[PDB]
Amino acid sequence: DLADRFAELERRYDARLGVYVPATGTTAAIEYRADERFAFCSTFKAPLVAAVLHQNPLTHLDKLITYTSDDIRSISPVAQQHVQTGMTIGQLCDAAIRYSDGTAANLLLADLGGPGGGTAAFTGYLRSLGDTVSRLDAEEPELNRDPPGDERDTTTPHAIALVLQQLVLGNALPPDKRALLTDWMARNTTGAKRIRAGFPADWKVIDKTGTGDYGRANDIAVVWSPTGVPYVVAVMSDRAGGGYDAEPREALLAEAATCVAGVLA
């Protein structure tokens, strides 16, 4: 019956909304277009960091990577600053999550190795976690601007929420590695107007945002009740019928998050 409010929000914002909240021990699952495909955009950077963490020892984070000015091919607020000094795999992880750095994601994909510069390796890592649906085919920034209807560089709310649940709440990572991913998402800077804005302030929120053309605006998050119960909230949206240049509407994601918060209360 909450699916009437979501469809009302889709009408209001001229957009398509996708919502998934995995069912917990006490409460039931929340689904709206939960098995419809939305574009990853930058949300893939969260399990990308987890893939590098799972495949390498903790001391692989101190390895220095250097890059040229020709590698800065997308918005890279941190990689742009360190073209002469270079950056370690740890700082690349910090940048790729907290500042959604495009270049940091592409080098992290390269560190994964393999065909397509690491896209195949990344999709393989998602498969190991049980995600049968998601797929990454391009690197930054081409992945953001796939045409609508094309299945490349897409996930689903259902699929991405279950990946995030294992990475933060489950056992996909050892505790010392799981605490680094969690801390990076807790100190994220790009999502203050989305799921964070939809939930009361005494609910803790860690998230990774995603934005691209065709009005694409995503936010995947883990949230904690004031009493400590954790939930996973996957919210994805696009406005593909409005064309390539359609503006994303962050208010839709905040409003949807407020609907969810009332149900989880």
Residues that bind a second copy (CB under 8 A): 1, 5, 9, 69-70, 72-78, 80-81, 83-85, 99-100, 102, 141, 189-190, 193, 197-202, 211, 213, 226-227, 245, 247-248, 251, 254-256, 258-263, 265
Q: How far is the CB of 207 from ligand TSL (least distance, A)?
A: 12
Which tokens sit at 110? 């390269």
CB of 250 to ligand TSL, least distance (A): 12
Q: With CB under 6 A, what is the number of residues at the site for ligand TSL?
A: 12
Binding flag, residue 117, ligand TSL (CB under 6 A): no
Decide which of ligand TSL, a second copy, none touches 263; Cβ closer than 5 to 8 Å per partner kind. Answer: a second copy
Q: Work out whether 119 is an interface residue with ligand TSL (CB under 6 A).
A: no
The smaller minimum CB distance to a second copy, of residues 54 and 145, is found at 145
CA distance 179 to 92: 17
What are the structure tokens assigned to 20, written together? 């998934």
State residue 212 phi and psi, 5-degree precision: -165, -175
Tell me if residue 74 is catalytic: no
From the list 116, 117, 141, 230, which residue makes contact with ligand TSL (rule: CB under 6 A)? Answer: 141
User: Contact, 21 vs 30, CB < 8 A?
Assistant: yes
Exactly one of 31, 140, 250, 255 is catalytic; name it.
140
152 binds, among a second copy, ligand TSL, none (CB under 5 to 8 A by kind): none
Which residues ranging from 61 to 100 are in contact with ligand TSL (CB under 6 A)? 74-75, 100
Residue among 218, 157, 200 at smallest CA distance from 21: 157
Cis peptide before 230 (omega within 30 of 0): no
Amino acid letter, residue 177: K
Q: Of 49-57, 140-148, 231-239, 252-260, which segment contacts ligand TSL by CB under 6 A?
A: 140-148
Q: What is the DSSP secondary-structure string of 89-138?
A: HHHHHHHHHHS--HHHHHHHHHHH-SGGGGHHHHHHHHHHTT--S-B---
- The contact mask relative to ligand TSL for 209-238 (x = CB under 6 A, - = no) is -xxx--------------------------
Query: What is the residue whose two structure tokens read 């605490």?
Result: 179
* Spatial CB neighbours of 120, under 8 Å, sequence gap ≥ 6: 114
Measured from the CB of residue 14, what is the shortest distance to ligand TSL in angstroms? 18
Determine phi and psi for 167, rounding to 5 degrees.
-75, -35
Number of Cβ within 10 Å of residue 217's Cβ equals 26
Q: Is 139 a catalytic residue?
A: no
Note the residues at the interface with ligand TSL (CB under 6 A): 41-42, 74-75, 100, 102, 140-141, 144, 210-212
Q: Which residues are catalytic?
A: 42, 140
